[PDB]
Design a protein around this ligand. Structure first.
Ligand SMILES: C=CC1=C(C)/C(=C/c2[nH]c(/C=C3N=C(/C=C4\NC(=O)C(C)=C4C=C)C(C)=C\3CCC(=O)O)c(CCC(=O)O)c2C)NC1=O
Ligand SMILES: *[C@@H]1O[C@H](CO)[C@@H](O[C@@H]2O[C@H](CO)[C@@H](O)[C@H](O)[C@H]2NC(C)=O)[C@H](O)[C@H]1NC(C)=O
Ligand SMILES: CCCCC/C=C\C/C=C/CCCCCCCC(=O)O
Ligand SMILES: *[C@@H]1O[C@H](CO)[C@@H](O)[C@H](O)[C@H]1NC(C)=O
Ligand SMILES: *[C@@H]1O[C@H](CO)[C@@H](O)[C@H](O)[C@H]1NC(C)=O
Ligand SMILES: *[C@@H]1O[C@H](CO)[C@@H](O)[C@H](O)[C@H]1NC(C)=O
Ligand SMILES: *[C@@H]1O[C@H](CO)[C@@H](O)[C@H](O)[C@H]1NC(C)=O
Ligand SMILES: *[C@@H]1O[C@H](CO)[C@@H](O)[C@H](O)[C@H]1NC(C)=O
Ligand SMILES: *[C@@H]1O[C@H](CO)[C@@H](O)[C@H](O)[C@H]1NC(C)=O
Ligand SMILES: *[C@@H]1O[C@H](CO)[C@@H](O)[C@H](O)[C@H]1NC(C)=O
Ligand SMILES: *[C@@H]1O[C@H](CO)[C@@H](O)[C@H](O)[C@H]1NC(C)=O
Ligand SMILES: *[C@@H]1O[C@H](CO)[C@@H](O)[C@H](O)[C@H]1NC(C)=O
Ligand SMILES: *[C@@H]1O[C@H](CO)[C@@H](O)[C@H](O)[C@H]1NC(C)=O
Lengths: 98, 49, 188, 383, 49
């Protein structure tokens, strides 16, 4: 993830990561380790291999995974699985410059 | 008949005091289950409850 | 170009209070039509809960939304959409007593619903939401009204005997010999 | 490639009564001679469990897409091992990950995988002509498998996949549930000699697996193994005889139970609290025997079934772009303060662009900010 | 802390600990030598002076 979102890896948090990508329980025995990975996952011109889900219908359950790439209908009209106005691709790319 | 009336009054007063005692927080953030369960998830609400 | 500790940080502090006064800043939820007189989970302006909603009369000054009783539990709430006062009651009540001959004899039982008329037992007990096995003990032919309450599952007998299982208000129940539970006024 | 069955004689769904079934160990702890109380997802006693069966001569082979509701009790009576797998998922369309448990007569395989499932999948069995035995040359479950994040191909084995005629000999009971991304399966196999609906007896379903699939499950279906021999006419869509097996599906609900652990550590009896007044008294008194008398009993009988939300109808999105996307902030000594009212604090708009180094909330759990209304909102802004 | 002795208990393969009515652990499976050991308090009440 990015640094600013490391705080979201904890029980009872909210945000992109703690709602749409990775959720932790509060009956959670275990522990969390995070370390800066610059000059290992960031390259010149931007590293776009790492993605994160930006739009979802509802929040995730704890330890639930969602790899679906279906188009997110933000507005009223169904856009029928093609990108367009008021429909977005739910996965966005981190831009990790060094 | 002060004795019998005293008995009845004692019982009624005890029950009313028991009802009144539900307003005490006992260290929790509130004395109402609904407020605790709405402000906090079970994560933090378990200890208060 | 200075260190991260010296870099500028923009800060906003959002101060508010909850569940104590009328609210205009709401979350991104969608309301639902009102279902009254049913054990239901409700959420009024973020105050969640479960119970039975009914209509009543209360004079709420414009700066008041909730009302609290002696026990401090919220009892009256102003509905934000349709401006009216609704009273919350628990969707159950104490006063259910189970009469039985002891196991190793039979599994039949009787139920005494205390201080309820036999006409209004189902609404009081919310038998619509109860299991099928609880509904047979809610209404039938063995329904008997007493000064204590309504007794179900035992046939009323005009005869009088000694007290085997005391019930109340001069009523005692026993296990006759097909085999069934009887309820009768005691013999002094 | 996959073939859709065309010959069907369907009846309305059948029901039966599940009595004192579906009890499982709730922990991996040994307790002996103890009356232990618990609350969890349990199958209520004396429940209307749905009945399905495959028998021939009326050419039913029923296997619909049943719904999954926070736990399921499955129980199959069979002798020839017809009922031989399950498919779980949310849409079963390859747009979402789906779970597949299949015993293909040599291995039991568990896959969490994006499957383009058939419409009426069947695992197949075939009485071979080149040799007088049973073995299957058809595996008709899915058409594609991509982005495939789990695998439990087991050690090889061999099983009596033959078609036996007579009386049932195996009752296999399973409890599935999906909690916190963990698929818990409890299992029990017992020999029974009955050709009826659910037998008389108490089971003690042991924990089998706790798989980490981490998916959303709302529907399933069963994978039945087609019989096929040289005594049936027609093509694959007609030339198949049904099996001779039956299954039953329940639906777990949150219930409080009493359980009795014997001297050897096994569960032998239980009480469904909130079933009938007598069980309610056994449950309140914490015993399996109640002597003659009248007992005051607590309130477990009624449980909620629906939820209501009643919020003000306000449509004006809240000024997130004026406090966060402000051209200029205030100096900390003259810190700005802004009243906020008549809002819908969706705050998902900030996800697109704004990233916050610190976001700490006091007096409120962050998860509950979507389920609340705030009275006197002030934004104090500075640098 | 306590006193370890040997005993007889049928532990299913997914069980390691055993708990009594008071919820204190009373039987433990020794991981190295597969056997069940019972833990008792290393003292007892009943001393009068
Ligand atoms: C489908 C998933 C599947 C599961 C979960 C499974 C579990 C399972 N099956 C077993 C035996 C066995 N399992 C089967 C067959 C089945 N058992 C079933 O759950 C099903 C659906 C069938 C086929 C219809 C048979 C025939 C035995 C041996 C019975 C015996 O030898 O008496 C055992 C005990 C193994 C042992 O004691 O060494 C386990 C744990 N086997 C499977 O194939
Ligand atoms: C798991 O899958 C189900 C089915 O897709 C989701 O429930 C549906 O969500 C949509 C909105 O996204 C609603 O229109 C449907 O009415 C819902 N159906 C039911 C029965 O609730 C569910 O949201 C998914 N669970 C999670 C955590 O994402
Ligand atoms: C215009 C301000 C409205 C104020 C509403 C007040 C309280 C309800 C919303 C609370 C959270 C504020 C947004 C913080 C988003 C953090 C998500 C993240 O990036 O991790
Ligand atoms: C919206 O709110 C108003 C008053 O606040 C109320 O009269 C009305 O019933 C609500 N619902 C709709 C659809 O307007
Ligand atoms: C309910 O019972 C009370 C006293 O028994 C009686 O006054 C009242 O009329 C009854 N109401 C009905 C509808 O029967
Ligand atoms: C459900 O079970 C009850 C008995 O507990 C029975 O009265 C009822 O008819 C059953 N309903 C269905 C649809 O099976
Ligand atoms: C008891 O007496 C009343 C009238 O005195 C009568 O109506 C009633 O039928 C009697 N009970 C039975 C079971 O017959
Ligand atoms: C089965 O037949 C084809 C595939 O062979 C499929 O497109 C169709 O949807 C299926 N028929 C029905 C009634 O579902
Ligand atoms: C099906 O059985 C065959 C027997 O050779 C085995 O190779 C295979 O692993 C089984 N299917 C899967 C998906 O493993
Ligand atoms: C999911 O499958 C599609 C099919 O091409 C592929 O493009 C995509 O990269 C896969 N995503 C993951 C996380 O495997
Ligand atoms: C407990 O286990 C032993 C040996 O397996 C057996 O003899 C005994 O019968 C079992 N206890 C009961 C009540 O059956
Ligand atoms: C805030 O500013 C950024 C950059 O101009 C823009 O991408 C984003 O849409 C804005 N978000 C809001 C809520 O105004
Ligand atoms: C090591 O473990 C095994 C079984 O786990 C046990 O038999 C053995 O006594 C232990 N100690 C040594 C030195 O191997």
């Amino acid at each position: 993830i990015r640094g600013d979102e490391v705080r979201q890896i904890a029980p009872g948090q909210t945000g992109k990561i703690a709602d749409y990508n990775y959720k932790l329980p509060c009956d959670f025995t275990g522990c969390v380790i995070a370390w800066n990975s610059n000059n290992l996952d960031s390259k010149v011109g931007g590293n776009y291999n790492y993605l994160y889900r930006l739009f979802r219908k509802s929040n995730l359950k704890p330890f639930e995974r969602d790899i679906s790439t279906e188009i997110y209908q933000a507005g009223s009209t169904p856009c029928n699985g093609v990108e367009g106005f008021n429909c977005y691709f739910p996965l966005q790319s981190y831009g990790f410059q060094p | 008949l002060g004795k019998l009336q005293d008995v009845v009054n004692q019982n009624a007063q005890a029950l009313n005091t028991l009802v009144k005692q539900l307003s005490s927080n006992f260290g929790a953030i509130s004395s109402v289950l609904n407020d605790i369960l709405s402000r906090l998830d079970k994560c933090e609400a378990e200890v208060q409850i | 170009t200075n260190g991260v500790g010296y870099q500028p940080y923009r800060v906003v502090v959002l101060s508010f209070e909850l569940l104590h006064a009328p609210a205009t800043v709401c979350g991104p939820k969608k309301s639902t039509n009102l279902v009254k007189n049913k054990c239901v989970n409700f959420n009024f302006n973020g105050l969640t809960g479960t119970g039975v909603l009914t209509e009543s009369n209360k004079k709420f000054l414009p700066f008041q939304q909730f009302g609290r009783d002696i026990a401090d539990t919220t009892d009256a709430v102003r509905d934000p959409q349709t401006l009216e006062i609704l009273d919350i009651t628990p969707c159950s009540f104490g006063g259910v007593s189970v009469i039985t001959p002891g196991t190793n004899t039979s599994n039949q039982v009787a139920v005494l619903y205390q201080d309820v008329n036999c006409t209004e037992v189902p609404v009081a007990i919310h038998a619509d939401q109860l299991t099928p096995t609880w509904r047979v003990y809610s209404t039938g032919s063995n329904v008997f009204q007493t000064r204590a309450g309504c007794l179900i599952g035992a046939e009323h007998v005009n005869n009088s005997y000694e007290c085997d299982i005391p019930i109340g208000a001069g009523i005692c129940a026993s296990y006759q010999t097909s085999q069934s539970i009887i309820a009768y006024t005691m013999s002094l | 490639q996959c073939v859709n069955l065309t010959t069907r004689t369907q009846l309305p769904p059948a029901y039966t009564n599940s009595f004192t079934r579906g009890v499982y160990y709730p922990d991996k702890v040994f307790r002996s001679s103890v009356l232990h109380s618990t609350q969890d997802l349990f199958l209520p006693f004396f429940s209307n469990v749905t009945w399905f069966h495959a028998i021939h001569v009326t050419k039913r082979f029923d296997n619909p897409v049943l719904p999954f509701n926070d736990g399921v009790y499955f129980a199959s009576t069979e002798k020839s091992n017809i009922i031989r797998g399950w498919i779980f998922g949310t849409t079963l369309d390859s747009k979402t990950q789906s779970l597949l448990i299949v015993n293909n007569a040599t291995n039991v395989v568990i896959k969490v995988c994006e499957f383009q499932f058939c419409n009426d999948p069947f695992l197949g069995v075939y009485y071979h002509k080149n040799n007088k035995s049973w073995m299957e040359s058809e595996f008709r479950v899915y058409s594609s498998a991509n982005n495939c994040t789990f695998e439990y191909v087991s050690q090889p084995f061999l099983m009596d996949l033959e078609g036996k005629q007579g009386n049932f000999k195996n009752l296999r009971e399973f409890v599935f549930k999906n909690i916190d991304g963990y698929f818990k399966i409890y299992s029990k196999h017992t020999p029974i000699n009955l050709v009826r609906d659910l037998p008389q007896g108490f089971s003690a379903l042991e924990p089998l697996v706790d798989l980490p699939i981490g998916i959303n499950i709302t529907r399933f279906q069963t994978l039945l193994a087609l019989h096929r021999s040289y005594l049936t006419p027609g093509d694959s869509s007609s030339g198949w005889t049904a099996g001779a097996a039956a299954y039953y599906v329940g639906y777990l609900q949150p219930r409080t139970f009493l359980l009795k652990y014997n001297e050897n550590g096994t569960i032998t009896d239980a009480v469904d609290c909130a079933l009938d007044p007598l069980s309610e008294t056994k449950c309140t008194l914490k015993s399996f025997t109640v002597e003659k008398g009248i007992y005051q009993t607590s309130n477990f009988r009624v449980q909620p079934t629906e939820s209501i939300v009643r919020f003000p109808n306000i449509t004006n999105l809240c000024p997130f772009g004026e406090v966060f996307n402000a051209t200029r902030f205030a100096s900390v000594y003259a810190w700005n303060r802004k009243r906020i009212s008549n809002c819908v604090a969706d705050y998902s708009v900030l996800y697109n662009s704004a990233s916050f180094s610190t976001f700490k909330c006091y007096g409120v759990s962050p998860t509950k900010l979507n389920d609340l209304c705030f009275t006197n909102v002030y934004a104090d802004s500075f640098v």
